[model samples]
Target: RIKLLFKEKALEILMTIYYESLGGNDVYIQYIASKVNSPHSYVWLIIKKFEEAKMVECELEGRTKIIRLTDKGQKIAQQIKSIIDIM
Candidate 1:
């Protein structure tokens, strides 16, 4: 049960990044925080974890951080969307 909520939050963050990238928008921590209705710090921490997992890549645009999913991340995001649609 504890793991469920934690995973859910991570999933939400990843999906938001995926969808926004799909729409050709650059993603950042604050933008993701707003979309997920989570605190910016919380989002940042999760994003760090994603970074370490090689699920996302982060770049700095002169102090602002931009985020995009790696190919592995995209594959997982696609699978998650498929599962949702099936449900």
Candidate 2:
């Protein structure tokens, strides 16, 4: 299912979300698509999987749906950044 696809690219996606949140800004699906240079629908598909896994959550702010990592996801993202930094 979608989980299989997410397993491959979840780290990249999480990192994008993590960086986007740097300015206290949540991400939008369109923003993720643009940032990752992927299709909007494709990003949406991945996000749904993250939501199911409880790694990310979205909330409606007007017509824009802002995406942010859950606590578990933020922890994971922090570790990922540090690991890459160490490398």
Top model by lDDT, which number?
1
Estimate the TM-score of every prediction. Answer: 0.89, 0.79
lDDT digits (tens) for residues 1-87 of candidate 1: 434434788989999999999999999777898899678888999999999999999999998889999999899899988876665
The alpha-carbon lDDT assigned to residue 77 of candidate 1 equals 90
Error of 1 at 58 (Å): 0.6
How many steric overlaps does candidate 1 have? 0
lDDT of each: 0.88, 0.79
Clashing pairs in 1: none
Clash number for each model: 0, 0
